[PDB]
Design a protein around this ligand. Structure first.
Ligand SMILES: Nc1nnc2c([nH]c3ccccc32)c1-c1ccccc1
Length: 116
């Protein structure tokens, strides 16, 4: 049970993550975040957990905002960048999931800059 963040910070983290999650592909209209909202279980995808040291998904990113685990936008950014790097490790270059993760990193940076 961590000490609560200032409300403005919690509110800002949620605003940024909400915008990344809602973002739609600029050609197909697909919500890029969809595959990354909730990890498959270990039973469903054991190869993922065999490879990736610290699985994260947008559900966990929201939990870490909620529980005040992130103490700044930099802590939040580190986990969103980890989510995308994990995608780049488990999926091939030139796969849609890989290339979607590169786009989502750019969306996070852009939205954070705007909300700041
Ligand atoms: N190749 C993937 N690669 N990365 C992830 C993922 N699901 C996630 C759910 C949450 C976080 C990362 C991932 C998948 C996947 C996509 C379709 C079906 C099963 C898993």
């Amino acid at each position: 049970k961590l000490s609560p963040n200032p409300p403005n910070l919690t509110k800002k983290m949620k605003k940024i993550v909400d915008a990344v999650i809602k973002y739609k592909d600029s050609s197909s209209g697909r919500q890029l975040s969809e595959v990354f909202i909730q990890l498959p279980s270990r039973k469903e995808l054991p190869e993922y957990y065999e490879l990736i040291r610290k699985p994260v998904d947008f559900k966990k990113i929201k939990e870490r905002i909620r529980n005040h685990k992130y103490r700044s936008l930099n802590d939040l950014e580190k986990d969103v960048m980890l989510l995308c790097q994990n995608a780049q490790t488990f999926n091939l270059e030139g796969s849609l999931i890989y290339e979607d993760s590169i786009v989502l990193q750019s969306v996070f940076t852009s939205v954070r800059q705007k909300i700041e």
